[model samples]
Target: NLYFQGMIQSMWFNLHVQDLEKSAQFYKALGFKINRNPQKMVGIQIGQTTVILIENKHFQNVSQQSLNTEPNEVMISLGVNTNEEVDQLVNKVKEAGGAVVQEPTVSQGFYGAMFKDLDGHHFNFLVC
Candidate 1:
C-alpha cells in the first residue's frame, strides 16, 4: 500500500561537494556522462539516474542543514549484469582515485563491491 499519488516526472540525487572540479573529473574518469551547469553544479549520469553535485555553501543554503559528518548517510546501489562487471567497475573506481571501502565479494548469491567518491559518499556496484 502506498500514498502520495502525485505523478513522478523524474528523480535525481543531490550531493554536496567541496571541490566541484575534482569531483567532476573523478566521475568523468569512471566513464560517466557529465552535465555542467552555470549555477556551479555538475550532474553525473549513473546508468539511468543522474546525480547532481552542488558546492557546499549552496548545498547548505538549499537544504538548510549542516553536512552530516557521520558515514552512511546514504548508500547508492548500482546494478550490473554480471559479477565481472562489478570487479571491472571496482578497478576503474580505484584508478579514478575513489576509495574502495569493500573489495568485490559474494555473499548468499550476491556479488558486490563498495566504494566512496571524492566527497566520501558511498556507492555499491552489484550483480544479483
Candidate 2:
C-alpha cells in the first residue's frame, strides 16, 4: 500500500536494456558513466546506485517472470529540486528519443512526469 509504513531500500538497480550501448548513453546523459561495459552488460554507478544493463533472457531468469514488452508495473523515480527542472528533464528525454507518455502536471505540493527510455524503461521525475 502507499500508506504502508515500511522502508524498502534497493541494494542495486538492474535494467534489461535491449540496446546496451544506447541505454548506456541514455543513463550517461543523467550523469552515469558507462565504464567497463561488456558485451551484453553495461555497468554504471551513480553514488551507491548500481545500474547493470543486461539482456532480456538474463533478466527473465533473474526476475523469474515473462517480460512485458509493451508496458509494465515498474517505474524508476527520481526527485528533482525545481519544477522547471522536471520540465527540463522531460525536454531532455525528448532530445534523447525517449517517449513522453505524460506531460508534466502540477498540483498542490506535487509535480510529476513520466517518460520511457530507448529500451522502454519508464522514468518518473517528480518535484514537491
Candidate 3:
C-alpha cells in the first residue's frame, strides 16, 4: 500500500462544481451517500472514498487556483462486483442526467463504462 509522509487517516477528492446543490442531487439520485458539511461543500460517499463537491467560488478560495477549463480535471474510476452491475449503473447514470461517454464493454477481461456528471466530471465504472 502507498503511504503519505504525514500518516493520513483518510483521503477524499475535492471537485469544483458550478452548482453544489444540483451536483449533490445528481449523486444522490445515483444512490451515493451525501454529507453536507461546512455549508459550502457536499460530500458524496462511494465505497471508502468521500468525493467532496464544492462551489466554484469556495474551491477557488481554498485551492488558490482557477477552475479547470478543460474537458475534465480528473477521471475517477470506480469498481463494481459484476459486469451486470456496471451496465445497471450506466443506465442509472443516464437516468440521473449523466452523459454516457462510453458504453459498457469488455476489454482485457474487464467490463467498464464511462460517464460525465452534471459539471462534466468524468467517471469510469469497471467490473472488478
Candidate 4:
C-alpha cells in the first residue's frame, strides 16, 4: 500500500545556541520571526522546510544529549534561488553580528556564502 501512505512531506531542523537574546538578535536581522520564553525558540516557517532554533539548555533538557559548541559536527546550509540572494545575505550577516568565514562565490553552478551565528554555529546561504 504505497509504502505507508505517501512520502516525507515536511522537514525541520533545530539549532542549539548558548545565548538566547544574543542568538535571537542574530537571526532577527535576517528577517527570521522569533519567539521567546521557557524554551527560547524561533521558526523560519510553521510549515514545510522549517528551520528551528532552540536555546542550548532547553535542547539538552529535552533531548537528554549534550550539544557540542563547534561547527564541524554538523553543517547547515541555507539554500536560495540566486547567487545575488547569497550576496545580500552575507552583507546583512555582518550587521546581524554574525561572521562570514567564506565569501560568496560560484563554482560548477554552486553559489554560496559561509557564516556563523553569534553563538558560533556554522551555516551558509547556498544556491545551485
Model 4 lDDT-worst window of ten: 39-48
TM-score of each: 0.86, 0.76, 0.85, 0.74
Give one digit per residue, the lDDT tens place, for model 2 in 1-128.
64685577446777787777788777778666577643467898756667788877888898999888785767887778888888888888888788998899974457988899887888788895
**CA deviation > 4 Å runs, candidate 3:** 1-7
Which lDDT tens digits does candidate 4 get at residues 1-128? 55876687565678777777777677778867665545357665422456777778899998898776575666777768887888888999998888899998875567888888887878878796
TM-score, model 1 to reference: 0.86
lDDT of 1 by residue, 12-125 (tens): 789999999999999888778999876489999966788889998999999998887755789888888898889889999999899998999985578998899988999888
The model with the greatest lDDT is 1
Which 10 consecutive positions of candidate 1 have the poorest summed lDDT? 1-10
Q: State the lDDT at 25 in candidate 3.
A: 84
Candidate 3 weakest ten by summed lDDT: 1-10
TM accuracy, model 3: 0.85
